[PDB]
Coordinates of C-alpha atoms and ligand atoms in Angstrom, one line a residue:
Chain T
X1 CA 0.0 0.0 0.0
X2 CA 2.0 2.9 1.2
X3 CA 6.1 2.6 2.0
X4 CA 6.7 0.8 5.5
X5 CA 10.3 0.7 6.3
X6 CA 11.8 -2.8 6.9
X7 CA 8.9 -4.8 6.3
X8 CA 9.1 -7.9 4.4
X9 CA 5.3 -9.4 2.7
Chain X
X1 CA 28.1 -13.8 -1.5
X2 CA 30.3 -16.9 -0.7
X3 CA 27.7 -20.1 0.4
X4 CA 24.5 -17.9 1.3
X5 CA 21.4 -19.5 0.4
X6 CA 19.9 -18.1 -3.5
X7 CA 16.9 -16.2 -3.0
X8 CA 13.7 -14.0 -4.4
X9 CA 13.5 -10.0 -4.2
X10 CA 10.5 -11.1 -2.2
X11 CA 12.8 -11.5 0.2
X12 CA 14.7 -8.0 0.3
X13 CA 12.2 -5.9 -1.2
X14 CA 14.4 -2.6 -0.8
X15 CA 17.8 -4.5 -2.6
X16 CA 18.1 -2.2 -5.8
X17 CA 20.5 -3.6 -8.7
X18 CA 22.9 -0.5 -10.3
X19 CA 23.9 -1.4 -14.1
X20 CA 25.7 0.9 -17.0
X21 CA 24.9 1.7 -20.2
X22 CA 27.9 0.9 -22.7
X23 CA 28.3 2.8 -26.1
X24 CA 27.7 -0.7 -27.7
X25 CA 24.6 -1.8 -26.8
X26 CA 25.4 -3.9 -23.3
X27 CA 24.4 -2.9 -19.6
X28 CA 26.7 -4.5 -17.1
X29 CA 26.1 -5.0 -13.8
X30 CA 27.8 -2.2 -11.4
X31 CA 26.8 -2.4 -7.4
X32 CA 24.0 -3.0 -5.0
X33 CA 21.8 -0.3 -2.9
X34 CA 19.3 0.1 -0.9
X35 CA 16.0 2.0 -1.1
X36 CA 16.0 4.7 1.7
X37 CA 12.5 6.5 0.7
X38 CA 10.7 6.7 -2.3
X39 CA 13.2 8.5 -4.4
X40 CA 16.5 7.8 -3.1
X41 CA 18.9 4.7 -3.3
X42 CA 22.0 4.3 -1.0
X43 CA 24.9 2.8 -2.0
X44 CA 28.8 3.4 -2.1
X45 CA 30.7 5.7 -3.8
X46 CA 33.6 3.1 -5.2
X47 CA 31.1 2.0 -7.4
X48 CA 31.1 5.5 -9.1
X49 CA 34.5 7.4 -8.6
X50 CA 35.9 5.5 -11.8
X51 CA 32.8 7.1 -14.0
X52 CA 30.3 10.1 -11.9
X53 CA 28.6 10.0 -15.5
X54 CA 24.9 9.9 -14.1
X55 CA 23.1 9.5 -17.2
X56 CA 24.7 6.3 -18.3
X57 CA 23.3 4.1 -14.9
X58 CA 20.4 2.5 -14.5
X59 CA 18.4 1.4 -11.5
X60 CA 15.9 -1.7 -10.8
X61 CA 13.7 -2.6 -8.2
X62 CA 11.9 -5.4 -7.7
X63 CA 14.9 -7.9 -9.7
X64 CA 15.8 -11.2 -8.4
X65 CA 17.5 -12.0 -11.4
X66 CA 20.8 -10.2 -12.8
X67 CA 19.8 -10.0 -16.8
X68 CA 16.6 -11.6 -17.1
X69 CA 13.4 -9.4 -16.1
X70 CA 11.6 -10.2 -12.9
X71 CA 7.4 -9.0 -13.0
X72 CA 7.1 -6.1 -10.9
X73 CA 10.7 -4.6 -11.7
X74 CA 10.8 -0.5 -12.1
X75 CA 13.7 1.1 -13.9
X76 CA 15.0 4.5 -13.4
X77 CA 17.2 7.1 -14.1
X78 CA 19.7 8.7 -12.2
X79 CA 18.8 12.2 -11.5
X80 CA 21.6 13.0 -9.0
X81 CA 24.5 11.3 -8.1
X82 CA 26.3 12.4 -4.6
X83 CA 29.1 10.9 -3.8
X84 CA 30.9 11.6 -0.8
X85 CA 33.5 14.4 -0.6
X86 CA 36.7 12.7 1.7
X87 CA 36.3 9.9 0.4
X88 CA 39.4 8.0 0.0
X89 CA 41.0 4.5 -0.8
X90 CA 44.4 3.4 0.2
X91 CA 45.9 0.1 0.1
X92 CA 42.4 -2.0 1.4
X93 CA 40.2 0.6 2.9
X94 CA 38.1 3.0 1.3
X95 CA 37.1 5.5 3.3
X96 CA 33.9 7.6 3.8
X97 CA 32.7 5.5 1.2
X98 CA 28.9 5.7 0.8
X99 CA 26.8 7.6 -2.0
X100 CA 23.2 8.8 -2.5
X101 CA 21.7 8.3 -5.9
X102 CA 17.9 10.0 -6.6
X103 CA 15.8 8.0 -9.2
X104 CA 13.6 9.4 -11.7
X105 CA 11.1 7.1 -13.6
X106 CA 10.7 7.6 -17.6
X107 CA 7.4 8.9 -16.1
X108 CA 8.8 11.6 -13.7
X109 CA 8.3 9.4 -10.4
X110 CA 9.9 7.7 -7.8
X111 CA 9.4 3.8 -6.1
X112 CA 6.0 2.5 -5.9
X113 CA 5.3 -0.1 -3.0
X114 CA 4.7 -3.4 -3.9
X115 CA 5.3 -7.0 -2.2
X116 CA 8.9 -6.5 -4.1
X117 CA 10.0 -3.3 -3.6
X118 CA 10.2 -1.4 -0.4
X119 CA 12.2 0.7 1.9
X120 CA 15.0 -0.3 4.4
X121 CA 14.8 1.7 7.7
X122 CA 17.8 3.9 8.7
X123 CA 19.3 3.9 12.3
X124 CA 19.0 6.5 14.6
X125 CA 22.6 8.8 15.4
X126 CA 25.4 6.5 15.9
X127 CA 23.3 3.7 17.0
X128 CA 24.1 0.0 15.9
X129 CA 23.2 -3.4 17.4
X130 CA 26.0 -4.9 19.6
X131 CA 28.8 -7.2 18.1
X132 CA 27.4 -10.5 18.2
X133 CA 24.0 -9.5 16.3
X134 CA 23.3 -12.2 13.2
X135 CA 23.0 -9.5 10.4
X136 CA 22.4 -10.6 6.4
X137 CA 23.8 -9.4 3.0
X138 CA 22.5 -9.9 0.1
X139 CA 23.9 -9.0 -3.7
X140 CA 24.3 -10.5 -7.2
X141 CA 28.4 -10.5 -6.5
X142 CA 30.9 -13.9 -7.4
X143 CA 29.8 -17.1 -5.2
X144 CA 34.1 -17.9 -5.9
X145 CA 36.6 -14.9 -5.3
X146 CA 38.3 -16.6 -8.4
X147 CA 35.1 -16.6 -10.6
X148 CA 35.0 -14.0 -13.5
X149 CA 31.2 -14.1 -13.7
X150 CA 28.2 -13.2 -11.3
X151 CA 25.6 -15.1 -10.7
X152 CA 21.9 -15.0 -12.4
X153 CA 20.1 -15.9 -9.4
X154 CA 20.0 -13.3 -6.2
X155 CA 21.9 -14.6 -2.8
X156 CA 21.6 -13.5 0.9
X157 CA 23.6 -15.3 3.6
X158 CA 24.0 -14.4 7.4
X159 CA 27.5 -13.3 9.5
X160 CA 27.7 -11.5 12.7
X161 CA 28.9 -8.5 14.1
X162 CA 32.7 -8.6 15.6
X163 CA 33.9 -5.8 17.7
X164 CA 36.2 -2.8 16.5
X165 CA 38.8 -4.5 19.0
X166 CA 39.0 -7.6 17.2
X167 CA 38.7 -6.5 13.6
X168 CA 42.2 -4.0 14.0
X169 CA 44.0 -6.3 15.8
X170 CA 47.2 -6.5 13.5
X171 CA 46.7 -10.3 12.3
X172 CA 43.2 -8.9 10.9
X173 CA 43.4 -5.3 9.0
X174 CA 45.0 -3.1 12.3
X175 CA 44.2 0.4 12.0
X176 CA 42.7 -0.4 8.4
X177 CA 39.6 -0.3 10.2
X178 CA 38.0 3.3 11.7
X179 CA 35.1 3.7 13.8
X180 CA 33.2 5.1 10.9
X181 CA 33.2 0.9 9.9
X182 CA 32.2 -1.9 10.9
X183 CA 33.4 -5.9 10.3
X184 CA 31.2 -8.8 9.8
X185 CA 32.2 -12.4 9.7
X186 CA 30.9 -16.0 10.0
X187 CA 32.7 -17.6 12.8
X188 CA 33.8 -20.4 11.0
X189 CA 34.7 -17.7 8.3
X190 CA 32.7 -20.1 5.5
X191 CA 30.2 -17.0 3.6
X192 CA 30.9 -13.2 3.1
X193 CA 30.2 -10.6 0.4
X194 CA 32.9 -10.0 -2.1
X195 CA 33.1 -8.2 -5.3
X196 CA 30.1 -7.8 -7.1
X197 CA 28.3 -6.9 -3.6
X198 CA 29.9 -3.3 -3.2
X199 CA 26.8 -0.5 -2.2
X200 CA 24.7 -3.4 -0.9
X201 CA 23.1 -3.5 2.6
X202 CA 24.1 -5.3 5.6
X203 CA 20.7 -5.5 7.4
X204 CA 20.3 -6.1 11.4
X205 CA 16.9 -6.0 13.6
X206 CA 17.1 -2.6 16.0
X207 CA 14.8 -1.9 18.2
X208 CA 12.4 -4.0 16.6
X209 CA 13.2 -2.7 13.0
X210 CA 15.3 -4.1 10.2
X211 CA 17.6 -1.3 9.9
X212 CA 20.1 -1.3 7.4
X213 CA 23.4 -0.9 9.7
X214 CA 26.0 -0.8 6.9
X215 CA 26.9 -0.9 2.8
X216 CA 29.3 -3.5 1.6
X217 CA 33.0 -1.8 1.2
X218 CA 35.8 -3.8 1.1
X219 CA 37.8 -6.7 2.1
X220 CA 40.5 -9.0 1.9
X221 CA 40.0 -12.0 -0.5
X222 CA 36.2 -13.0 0.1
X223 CA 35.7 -15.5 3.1
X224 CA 39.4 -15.4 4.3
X225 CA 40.0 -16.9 8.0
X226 CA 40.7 -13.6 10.0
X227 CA 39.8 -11.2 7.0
X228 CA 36.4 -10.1 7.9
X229 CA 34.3 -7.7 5.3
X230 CA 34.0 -4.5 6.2
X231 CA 31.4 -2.2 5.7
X232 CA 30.5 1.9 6.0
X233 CA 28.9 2.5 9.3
X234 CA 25.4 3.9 8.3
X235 CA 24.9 5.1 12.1
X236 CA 27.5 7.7 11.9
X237 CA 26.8 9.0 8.3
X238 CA 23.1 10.5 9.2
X239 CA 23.6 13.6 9.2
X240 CA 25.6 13.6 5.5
X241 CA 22.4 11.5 4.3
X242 CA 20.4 14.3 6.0
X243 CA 21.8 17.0 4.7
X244 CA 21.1 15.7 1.2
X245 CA 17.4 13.7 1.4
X246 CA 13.9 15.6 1.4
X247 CA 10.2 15.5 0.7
X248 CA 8.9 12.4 -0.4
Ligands
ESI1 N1 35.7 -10.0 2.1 C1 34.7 -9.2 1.7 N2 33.6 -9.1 2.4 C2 34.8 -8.4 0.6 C3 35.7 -8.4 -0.5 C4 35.5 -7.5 -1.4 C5 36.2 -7.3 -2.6 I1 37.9 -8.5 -3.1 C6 35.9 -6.3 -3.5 C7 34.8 -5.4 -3.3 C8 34.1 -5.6 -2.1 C9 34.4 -6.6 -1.2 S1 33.6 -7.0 0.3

């Protein structure tokens, strides 16, 4: 969705 | 990477691939970087001093193969190039060795989030995780020190922190090694980066965040017994990046 530092999916 | 495990941009969503344009028709591969925000990639300036011409690199995100397209890849441009002023390279070392590159799309935009391309987190003023701390690299560099080629496939692989103290004693790379680095090593010294991995990120967990705690510089050999790799301290170049980053 938006940019969330360091998070893998 | 030496051993390392091959793996999927999936993986290392903010891992962005540098290549050059030739006056020929061939792009060949150049360093590694890491997405900070939307418009700006991080990597090492090394990887530029022989060439600062801008307008011959290209950027992907979103690649986990080196010349074969990946779905979801973005190219860009480079719109600014910064690399850093003191930097320096003796004999081993390279020093103050990081660089900032802003990307432009053909469109005239900057990284889209997508389950393959994100951004890494940057530490807070000299902050890093203790020596000890399991950290991974990742990077399209040789899997041999003596191989000629890189490999197609993307690789990460895991080494630890060591302390400042350990890293200059004089059997290692003695005062090689400044505070404004940091050494990683496997303990049975079996994977490392080498060349081809140059810009790319060493990433630790801080305070609950992956943080990108340093950019692959430089080493002796790849995976040599008491020559760990060394990397640019992130941590102690925030207010360089600062002074350089804005808006979104
Ligand atoms: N031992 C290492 N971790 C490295 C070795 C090199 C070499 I040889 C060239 C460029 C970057 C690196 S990192």
């Amino acid at each position: 969705l938006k940019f969330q530092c360091g998070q893998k999916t | 990477i030496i051993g390392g495990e091959f793996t999927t941009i999936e993986n290392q969503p903010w891992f962005a691939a540098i290549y050059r344009r030739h006056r020929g028709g061939s792009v060949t591969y150049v360093c590694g970087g890491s997405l900070m925000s939307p418009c700006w990639v991080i990597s090492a300036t090394h990887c530029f001093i022989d060439y600062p011409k801008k307008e011959d690199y290209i950027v992907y995100l979103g690649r986990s193969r080196l010349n074969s397209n990946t779905q979801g890849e973005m190219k860009f441009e480079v719109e600014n190039l910064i690399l850093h002023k003191d930097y320096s390279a003796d004999t081993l070392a390279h020093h103050n060795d990081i660089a900032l590159l802003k990307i432009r799309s053909k469109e005239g935009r900057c990284a889209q989030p997508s389950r393959t391309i994100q951004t890494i987190c940057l530490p807070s003023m000299y902050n890093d995780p203790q020596f000890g701390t399991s950290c991974e690299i990742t990077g399209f560099g040789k899997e041999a020190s003596t191989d000629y080629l890189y490999p197609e496939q993307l690789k990460m692989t895991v080494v630890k922190l060591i302390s400042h103290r350990e890293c200059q004693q004089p059997h290692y790379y003695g005062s090689e090694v400044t505070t404004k680095m940091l050494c990683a090593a496997d303990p049975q010294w079996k994977t490392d980066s080498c060349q081809g991995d140059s810009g790319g990120p060493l990433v630790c967990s801080l305070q609950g965040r992956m943080t990108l705690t340093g950019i692959v510089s430089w080493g002796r050999g790849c995976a040599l017994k008491d020559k760990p790799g060394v990397y640019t301290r992130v941590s102690h170049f925030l207010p360089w990046i600062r002074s350089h980053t804005k808006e979104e």
